[PDB]
Enzyme design. Structure first.
Site, PDB file in Angstrom:
ATOM      1  N   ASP A 133       0.826  -1.208   0.000  1.00  0.00           N
ATOM      2  CA  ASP A 133       0.000   0.000   0.000  1.00  0.00           C
ATOM      3  C   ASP A 133       0.861   1.260   0.000  1.00  0.00           C
ATOM      4  OD1 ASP A 133      -3.051  -0.703   0.298  1.00  0.00           O
ATOM      5  OD2 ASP A 133      -2.032  -2.098   1.670  1.00  0.00           O
ATOM      6  N   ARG A 137      -1.182   8.978   0.114  1.00  0.00           N
ATOM      7  CA  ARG A 137      -2.216   9.012   1.161  1.00  0.00           C
ATOM      8  C   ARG A 137      -1.782   8.310   2.478  1.00  0.00           C
ATOM      9  NH1 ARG A 137      -6.821   4.487   1.600  1.00  0.00           N
ATOM     10  NH2 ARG A 137      -6.124   5.009   3.724  1.00  0.00           N
ATOM     11  N   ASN A 138      -0.828   7.382   2.396  1.00  0.00           N
ATOM     12  CA  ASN A 138      -0.333   6.647   3.562  1.00  0.00           C
ATOM     13  C   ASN A 138       0.967   7.199   4.158  1.00  0.00           C
ATOM     14  OD1 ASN A 138      -1.546   3.705   1.787  1.00  0.00           O
ATOM     15  ND2 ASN A 138      -2.587   4.898   3.318  1.00  0.00           N
ATOM     16  N   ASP A 151       0.696   4.195   9.805  1.00  0.00           N
ATOM     17  CA  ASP A 151       0.361   2.891  10.382  1.00  0.00           C
ATOM     18  C   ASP A 151      -0.016   1.908   9.269  1.00  0.00           C
ATOM     19  OD1 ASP A 151      -0.350   1.099  12.690  1.00  0.00           O
ATOM     20  OD2 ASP A 151      -2.265   1.208  11.642  1.00  0.00           O
TER      21      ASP A 151
HETATM   22  C1  LIG Z   1      -2.086  16.100  13.703  1.00  0.00           C
HETATM   23  O1  LIG Z   1      -1.871  14.808  13.120  1.00  0.00           O
HETATM   24  C2  LIG Z   1      -2.668  14.421  12.077  1.00  0.00           C
HETATM   25  C3  LIG Z   1      -3.717  15.165  11.553  1.00  0.00           C
HETATM   26  C4  LIG Z   1      -4.421  14.693  10.447  1.00  0.00           C
HETATM   27  C5  LIG Z   1      -5.507  15.545   9.865  1.00  0.00           C
HETATM   28  O2  LIG Z   1      -5.384  16.767   9.824  1.00  0.00           O
HETATM   29  N1  LIG Z   1      -6.612  14.924   9.419  1.00  0.00           N
HETATM   30  C6  LIG Z   1      -7.760  15.653   8.875  1.00  0.00           C
HETATM   31  C7  LIG Z   1      -8.873  15.729   9.903  1.00  0.00           C
HETATM   32  C8  LIG Z   1     -10.091  16.453   9.332  1.00  0.00           C
HETATM   33  N2  LIG Z   1     -10.568  15.753   8.101  1.00  0.00           N
HETATM   34  C9  LIG Z   1     -11.825  16.361   7.581  1.00  0.00           C
HETATM   35  C10 LIG Z   1      -9.494  15.739   7.061  1.00  0.00           C
HETATM   36  C11 LIG Z   1      -8.260  15.010   7.593  1.00  0.00           C
HETATM   37  C12 LIG Z   1      -4.075  13.465   9.884  1.00  0.00           C
HETATM   38  C13 LIG Z   1      -3.035  12.715  10.399  1.00  0.00           C
HETATM   39  C14 LIG Z   1      -2.320  13.174  11.506  1.00  0.00           C
HETATM   40  N3  LIG Z   1      -1.268  12.444  12.101  1.00  0.00           N
HETATM   41  C15 LIG Z   1      -1.094  11.100  12.269  1.00  0.00           C
HETATM   42  N4  LIG Z   1      -0.089  10.743  13.084  1.00  0.00           N
HETATM   43  C16 LIG Z   1       0.014   9.433  13.344  1.00  0.00           C
HETATM   44  C17 LIG Z   1      -0.853   8.475  12.839  1.00  0.00           C
HETATM   45  C18 LIG Z   1      -0.686   7.024  13.191  1.00  0.00           C
HETATM   46  F1  LIG Z   1      -0.334   6.282  12.137  1.00  0.00           F
HETATM   47  F2  LIG Z   1       0.238   6.821  14.106  1.00  0.00           F
HETATM   48  F3  LIG Z   1      -1.802   6.488  13.681  1.00  0.00           F
HETATM   49  C19 LIG Z   1      -1.849   8.996  11.981  1.00  0.00           C
HETATM   50  O3  LIG Z   1      -2.595   8.057  11.321  1.00  0.00           O
HETATM   51  C20 LIG Z   1      -3.391   8.404  10.227  1.00  0.00           C
HETATM   52  C21 LIG Z   1      -4.435   9.319  10.311  1.00  0.00           C
HETATM   53  C22 LIG Z   1      -5.153   9.634   9.167  1.00  0.00           C
HETATM   54  C23 LIG Z   1      -4.849   9.025   7.958  1.00  0.00           C
HETATM   55  C24 LIG Z   1      -3.819   8.092   7.873  1.00  0.00           C
HETATM   56  C25 LIG Z   1      -3.074   7.771   9.009  1.00  0.00           C
HETATM   57  C26 LIG Z   1      -2.041   6.771   8.656  1.00  0.00           C
HETATM   58  O4  LIG Z   1      -1.208   6.288   9.401  1.00  0.00           O
HETATM   59  C27 LIG Z   1      -2.202   6.441   7.189  1.00  0.00           C
HETATM   60  C28 LIG Z   1      -3.351   7.319   6.666  1.00  0.00           C
HETATM   61  N5  LIG Z   1      -1.986  10.275  11.691  1.00  0.00           N
END
Ligand SMILES: COc1cc(C(=O)N[C@H]2CC[N@H+](C)CC2)ccc1Nc1ncc(C(F)(F)F)c(Oc2cccc3c2C(=O)CC3)n1
Length: 261
Positions: A133, A137-138, A151
């Site tokens: 994958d 996006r990841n 993750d």
């Molecule tokens: C502040 O940190 C983060 C913020 C945002 C964000 O703004 N999202 C917005 C919110 C509002 N909507 C409307 C739009 C998107 C995304 C990811 C973050 N940081 C972060 N840090 C660590 C992890 C992990 F892996 F450890 F769990 C993580 O996991 C994900 C989270 C989302 C997607 C994926 C992962 C994956 O591991 C692969 C794909 N994400």
């Protein structure tokens, strides 16, 4: 030990969704080392042990890896509601980060991100792990000079990123991950634009077999686009290895950094 007491976790805003449930940002207050920002994967159905085992196996999967450009496992809360505590990449998803910074990120930062991802993938290949994958996006952004593979559970058909042998015969090897990494490099140099926009998934296979390839991104150095095209050799044995991509991306990065100083 990886078991975390629930009172040490403060659940913050939702940052995404996974197969098992919402993903949140939050705060972890460790006994000896204060306020740590963390990501919290939740699981709506693991009152059932069948779901619990599949969910917690995703934490076990990240536990075996230790690399600077792969998100780390912090711990787990194995009683209901079951949670997995991960490292937080504070700048979020790479696609949004590159779109927002389309006109502010220098080319050396884009090459740096491709290089850092190649080190994580060369590392996973040395551990005999086939990702399947690899896509923008990841990828998450830890800071302006640091990206990490997200993750592996949250990273899970992406036909537009897949190698022909993965689409045709479900063959998944390090060579098929190289094809996917080539697509991921193209997405970075395109500032978070998805490959094959406006094309149906069923017609991707036909275009690839006709010799068509994703075009050179605007302002991409020809040497870097030439590296992407080597990842897209139809024959998997003609594709470069991750160690070769890692060496070549380092040469391209240092050549770009030398042009500034
Ligand atoms: C502040 O940190 C983060 C913020 C945002 C964000 O703004 N999202 C917005 C919110 C509002 N909507 C409307 C739009 C998107 C995304 C990811 C973050 N940081 C972060 N840090 C660590 C992890 C992990 F892996 F450890 F769990 C993580 O996991 C994900 C989270 C989302 C997607 C994926 C992962 C994956 O591991 C692969 C794909 N994400």
């Amino acid at each position: 030990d990886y078991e975390i007491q629930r009172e040490r976790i403060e659940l913050g805003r939702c940052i995404g969704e996974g197969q098992f449930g919402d993903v949140h940002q939050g705060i972890y207050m460790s006994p000896e080392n204060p306020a740590l920002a963390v990501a919290i994967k939740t699981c709506k159905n693991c009152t059932s042990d069948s779901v619990r085992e599949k969910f917690l196996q995703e934490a076990l999967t990240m536990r075996q890896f230790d690399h600077p450009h792969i998100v780390k496992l912090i711990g787990v809360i194995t009683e209901n509601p079951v949670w997995i505590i991960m490292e937080l990449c504070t700048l979020g998803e790479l696609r949004s980060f590159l779109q927002v910074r389309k006109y502010s990120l220098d080319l050396a930062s884009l090459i740096l991100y491709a290089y850092q991802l190649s080190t994580a993938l060369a590392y996973l290949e040395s551990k005999r792990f086939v990702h399947r994958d690899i896509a923008a996006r990841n990828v998450l952004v830890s800071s302006n000079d640091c990206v990490k593979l997200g993750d592996f559970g949250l990273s899970r058909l992406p036909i537009k990123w897949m190698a022909p042998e993965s689409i045709n015969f479900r063959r998944f090897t390090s060579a098929s991950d190289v094809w996917m990494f080539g697509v991921c490099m193209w997405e970075i140099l395109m500032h978070g634009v998805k490959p094959f926009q406006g094309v149906k998934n069923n017609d991707v296979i036909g275009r690839i077999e006709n010799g068509e390839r994703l075009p050179m991104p605007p302002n991409c150095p020809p040497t870097l686009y030439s590296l992407m095209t080597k990842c897209w050799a139809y024959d998997p044995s003609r594709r470069p290895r991750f160690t070769e991509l890692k060496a070549q991306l380092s040469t391209i990065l240092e050549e770009e950094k030398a042009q500034q100083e």
